[PDB]
Motif scaffolding. Structure first.
Motif, PDB file in Angstrom:
ATOM      1  N   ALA A  44       0.873  -1.178   0.000  1.00 40.96           N
ATOM      2  CA  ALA A  44       0.000   0.000   0.000  1.00 40.96           C
ATOM      3  C   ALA A  44       0.907   1.224   0.000  1.00 40.96           C
ATOM      4  O   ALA A  44       2.033   1.185   0.504  1.00 40.96           O
ATOM      5  CB  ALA A  44      -0.887  -0.032   1.229  1.00 40.96           C
ATOM      6  N   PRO A  45       0.436   2.341  -0.559  1.00 39.93           N
ATOM      7  CA  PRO A  45       1.185   3.585  -0.466  1.00 39.93           C
ATOM      8  C   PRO A  45       1.353   4.044   0.977  1.00 39.93           C
ATOM      9  O   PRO A  45       0.487   3.789   1.817  1.00 39.93           O
ATOM     10  CB  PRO A  45       0.307   4.608  -1.173  1.00 39.93           C
ATOM     11  N   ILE A  46       2.447   4.767   1.205  1.00 45.64           N
ATOM     12  CA  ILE A  46       2.811   5.424   2.489  1.00 45.64           C
ATOM     13  C   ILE A  46       3.247   6.858   2.169  1.00 45.64           C
ATOM     14  O   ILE A  46       3.993   7.065   1.201  1.00 45.64           O
ATOM     15  CB  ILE A  46       3.941   4.661   3.202  1.00 45.64           C
ATOM     16  N   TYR A  89       7.424   6.200  -6.579  1.00 48.23           N
ATOM     17  CA  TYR A  89       7.237   7.451  -5.815  1.00 48.23           C
ATOM     18  C   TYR A  89       6.340   8.337  -6.658  1.00 48.23           C
ATOM     19  O   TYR A  89       6.616   8.580  -7.878  1.00 48.23           O
ATOM     20  CB  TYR A  89       8.578   8.102  -5.466  1.00 48.23           C
ATOM     21  N   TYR A  90       5.302   8.861  -6.003  1.00 52.78           N
ATOM     22  CA  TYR A  90       4.278   9.749  -6.593  1.00 52.78           C
ATOM     23  C   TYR A  90       4.304  11.084  -5.865  1.00 52.78           C
ATOM     24  O   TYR A  90       4.253  11.082  -4.626  1.00 52.78           O
ATOM     25  CB  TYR A  90       2.882   9.123  -6.492  1.00 52.78           C
ATOM     26  N   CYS A  91       4.378  12.173  -6.616  1.00 51.75           N
ATOM     27  CA  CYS A  91       4.079  13.527  -6.117  1.00 51.75           C
ATOM     28  C   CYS A  91       2.600  13.831  -6.382  1.00 51.75           C
ATOM     29  O   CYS A  91       1.975  13.173  -7.267  1.00 51.75           O
ATOM     30  CB  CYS A  91       4.999  14.588  -6.700  1.00 51.75           C
ATOM     31  N   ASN A  98      -9.536  20.168  -7.570  1.00 51.47           N
ATOM     32  CA  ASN A  98      -8.830  19.217  -8.460  1.00 51.47           C
ATOM     33  C   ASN A  98      -7.485  18.830  -7.829  1.00 51.47           C
ATOM     34  O   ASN A  98      -6.524  19.637  -7.861  1.00 51.47           O
ATOM     35  CB  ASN A  98      -8.804  19.725  -9.900  1.00 51.47           C
ATOM     36  N   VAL A  99      -7.482  17.635  -7.237  1.00 46.97           N
ATOM     37  CA  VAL A  99      -6.292  16.830  -6.850  1.00 46.97           C
ATOM     38  C   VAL A  99      -5.577  16.395  -8.134  1.00 46.97           C
ATOM     39  O   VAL A  99      -6.254  15.820  -9.011  1.00 46.97           O
ATOM     40  CB  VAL A  99      -6.706  15.595  -6.029  1.00 46.97           C
ATOM     41  N   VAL A 100      -4.263  16.610  -8.207  1.00 42.26           N
ATOM     42  CA  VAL A 100      -3.388  16.235  -9.353  1.00 42.26           C
ATOM     43  C   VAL A 100      -2.250  15.386  -8.781  1.00 42.26           C
ATOM     44  O   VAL A 100      -1.557  15.889  -7.880  1.00 42.26           O
ATOM     45  CB  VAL A 100      -2.883  17.493 -10.093  1.00 42.26           C
TER      46      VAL A 100
ATOM     47  N   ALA B  44      -0.296   2.648 -12.542  1.00 43.94           N
ATOM     48  CA  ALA B  44      -0.464   3.620 -11.433  1.00 43.94           C
ATOM     49  C   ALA B  44      -1.918   3.575 -10.964  1.00 43.94           C
ATOM     50  O   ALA B  44      -2.811   3.152 -11.711  1.00 43.94           O
ATOM     51  CB  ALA B  44      -0.094   5.014 -11.862  1.00 43.94           C
ATOM     52  N   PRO B  45      -2.183   4.013  -9.714  1.00 42.26           N
ATOM     53  CA  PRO B  45      -3.543   4.133  -9.201  1.00 42.26           C
ATOM     54  C   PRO B  45      -4.331   5.242  -9.898  1.00 42.26           C
ATOM     55  O   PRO B  45      -3.713   6.165 -10.404  1.00 42.26           O
ATOM     56  CB  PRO B  45      -3.368   4.570  -7.744  1.00 42.26           C
ATOM     57  N   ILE B  46      -5.659   5.148  -9.834  1.00 38.49           N
ATOM     58  CA  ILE B  46      -6.595   6.228 -10.267  1.00 38.49           C
ATOM     59  C   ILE B  46      -7.553   6.536  -9.100  1.00 38.49           C
ATOM     60  O   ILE B  46      -7.773   5.653  -8.246  1.00 38.49           O
ATOM     61  CB  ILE B  46      -7.319   5.828 -11.571  1.00 38.49           C
ATOM     62  N   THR B  47      -8.074   7.748  -9.041  1.00 39.09           N
ATOM     63  CA  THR B  47      -9.092   8.148  -8.050  1.00 39.09           C
ATOM     64  C   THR B  47     -10.439   7.632  -8.550  1.00 39.09           C
ATOM     65  O   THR B  47     -10.781   7.952  -9.699  1.00 39.09           O
ATOM     66  CB  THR B  47      -9.125   9.657  -7.845  1.00 39.09           C
ATOM     67  N   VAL B  48     -11.169   6.877  -7.729  1.00 36.91           N
ATOM     68  CA  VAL B  48     -12.578   6.506  -8.064  1.00 36.91           C
ATOM     69  C   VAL B  48     -13.573   7.302  -7.197  1.00 36.91           C
ATOM     70  O   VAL B  48     -14.719   7.530  -7.675  1.00 36.91           O
ATOM     71  CB  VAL B  48     -12.776   4.982  -8.012  1.00 36.91           C
ATOM     72  N   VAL B 100      -3.026   9.429   5.389  1.00 37.07           N
ATOM     73  CA  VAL B 100      -3.076   8.025   5.866  1.00 37.07           C
ATOM     74  C   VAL B 100      -3.784   7.180   4.807  1.00 37.07           C
ATOM     75  O   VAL B 100      -4.856   7.583   4.330  1.00 37.07           O
ATOM     76  CB  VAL B 100      -3.752   7.930   7.245  1.00 37.07           C
ATOM     77  N   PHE B 101      -3.197   6.039   4.453  1.00 41.85           N
ATOM     78  CA  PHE B 101      -3.816   5.052   3.549  1.00 41.85           C
ATOM     79  C   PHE B 101      -4.197   3.799   4.327  1.00 41.85           C
ATOM     80  O   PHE B 101      -3.449   3.385   5.232  1.00 41.85           O
ATOM     81  CB  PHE B 101      -2.864   4.663   2.422  1.00 41.85           C
ATOM     82  N   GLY B 102      -5.273   3.158   3.890  1.00 37.87           N
ATOM     83  CA  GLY B 102      -5.553   1.749   4.235  1.00 37.87           C
ATOM     84  C   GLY B 102      -4.536   0.805   3.616  1.00 37.87           C
ATOM     85  O   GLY B 102      -3.773   1.215   2.723  1.00 37.87           O
TER      86      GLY B 102
END
Ligand SMILES: CC(C)C[C@H]1NC(=O)N(CC(=O)Nc2ccc(C(F)(F)F)cc2)C1=O
Lengths: 215, 215
Positions: A44-46, A89-91, A98-100, B44-48, B100-102
Motif C-alpha cells: 500500500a502507499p505510504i 514514488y508519486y508527487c 482538483n487533486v493532481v 499507477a492508481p486512479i481516483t474513483v 493516511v492510507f488503508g
C-alpha cells in the motif's frame, strides 16, 4: 487542470543519494502543497512527505522534500539509499477541488549492472494481413533496471489507441524483457509511410521504424 | 495519529454488489474527507471517489462512496461488478500530521471465462538481418487464464536453445499477453525450411509457421 511531470525512473546503488523531480505544467509550484507517496512493490502507499517538506513520524530524515520556484518543481531527495527504498514514488498537489498526481517514478536500488535494451521492430506478418490484422511488435530484451517507457509514432505523430505493453519480466539471463504491440488494421498500416517504436531506458531513448515494402 | 483498516481481500461474481469497508482506528471517520483509489497490476492508481462520495469524470456510476458514523467507517460499494473492476482498492484520509492510507483490498472477480490466445509469428526483419541477427517473435494475446507453454520447431524438430517467453501480464482488455522470442543467427534461420511456434493453453495448441522470404 495542470499536470505534474515526474521522470519515469531513477536508479542508484546502496548508500548513494537520488533525487526525483515533479514539475508543475502551469501555475505556481508554491501556490499549493506537494505530498510524496512511496509504494513498494506488493504494498500500500505510504506518505514520506506532506506540505512540501514535512516528514511524518517514523519516516527517516534520509527523505527530504524541497520546492524549486525557479524551475516550478518539487523534489524528493533520498540519501543513504537502502534496498527497502526500491518503490514507485508519486508527487501530488491541487488547484481548487482538483487533486493532481504525478505519473510516478520507479526507483531501482541497483542489484546488478545496468544493461541497455535490445529493441527490434517487426512489420506485419503475411499470415495476419490475411486475417485483416497489421499488428506491429516491438521486442525489448536484455535490460536492467526493469523500467521502460514505450511510445509509438504513425509517421511523426504520437499514436495513442491500440498500444499494449507487457510488464517486464526477468528472463533466463536475469535481465528483463517485454514487448509492445500496436494492433493496426491493414488500412491504417498502408495509409502511412512508416511506424516507429521509441523505447526510453535510464534516460536514453532508442527508436526503430518500419514501412510497407515491395517483396 | 490513526490507521485505516480494510479487508485484505474480497471475491464476488459478475453482476453482484461488493462492499469494501475502511475503519478509522482513532478519531471520527467524519472529521476528514475519504478518497478511494483503484490500482490495476503494473499500472499507477486512479481516483474513483473523493470527498467521501464524489465520482471523478470517467468513473462509472457503479462506484459509490459512503460513510457510516456508527461503525466509524467508510465504504466503497461497486454495483453490477465487471471483470475490469478486478484491482487493488485503497481508502485514504488525513489528520494534519499525515496523509493516511488503508492497507488495500484485493478484489477478485470470480468466474472469468477461459479465452483462447491469438498467436502471431513474425519472421526476422530485413533490418535485424542486416545487423547480423535473426530473432523471431511469437506474440500471444487475449488469453485467460494467464498461463501458456510454448515450444519451437526448426523444420519438424524441437528447438532446445535460444527460447525466452515473457511472464504473462494482464492487458487493458483484462486478458493476458506474452511474447516468446527465439534468438537465431542469420545462418540458422536460412539453414531451415521454416520455424514454428506452438502455443498450448488449457490443453489446446495453436501452431504458426514462418519461412525465409524470396526478395
Ligand atoms: C479528478 C481527480 C480527483 C482524479 C484523477 N487525477 C489524477 O491525478 N488521477 C490519477 C491518480 O489518482 N493517481 C494516483 C497515483 C498514486 C496514488 C497513490 F499515492 F499511490 F496512492 C494515488 C493516485 C486521477 O485519477
Amino acid at each position: 487542470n495542470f499536470m505534474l511531470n515526474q521522470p519515469h525512473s531513477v536508479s542508484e546503488s546502496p548508500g548513494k543519494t537520488v533525487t526525483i523531480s515533479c514539475t508543475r505544467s502551469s501555475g505556481n509550484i508554491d501556490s499549493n502543497y506537494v505530498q510524496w507517496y512511496q509504494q513498494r512493490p506488493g504494498s500500500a502507499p505510504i506518505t514520506v512527505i506532506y506540505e512540501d517538506n514535512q516528514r511524518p513520524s517514523g519516516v527517516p530524515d534520509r527523505f527530504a522534500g524541497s520546492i524549486d520556484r525557479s524551475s516550478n518543481s518539487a523534489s524528493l531527495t533520498i540519501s543513504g539509499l537502502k534496498t527497502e527504498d526500491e518503490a514507485d514514488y508519486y508527487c501530488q498537489s491541487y488547484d481548487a477541488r482538483n487533486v493532481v498526481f504525478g505519473g510516478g517514478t520507479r526507483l531501482t536500488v541497483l542489484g546488478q549492472p545496468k544493461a541497455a535494451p535490445s529493441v527490434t521492430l517487426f512489420p506485419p506478418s503475411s499470415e495476419e494481413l490475411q486475417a485483416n490484422k497489421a499488428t506491429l511488435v516491438c521486442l525489448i530484451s536484455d535490460f536492467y533496471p526493469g523500467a521502460v517507457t514505450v511510445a509509438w509514432k504513425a509517421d511523426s505523430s504520437p499514436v495513442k489507441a491500440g498500444v499494449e505493453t507487457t510488464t517486464p519480466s526477468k528472463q533466463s539471463n536475469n535481465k528483463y524483457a517485454a514487448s509492445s504491440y500496436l494492433s493496426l488494421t491493414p488500412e491504417q498500416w498502408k495509409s502511412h509511410k512508416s511506424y516507429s517504436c521509441q523505447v526510453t531506458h535510464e534516460g536514453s531513448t532508442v527508436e526503430k521504424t518500419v514501412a510497407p515494402t515491395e517483396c
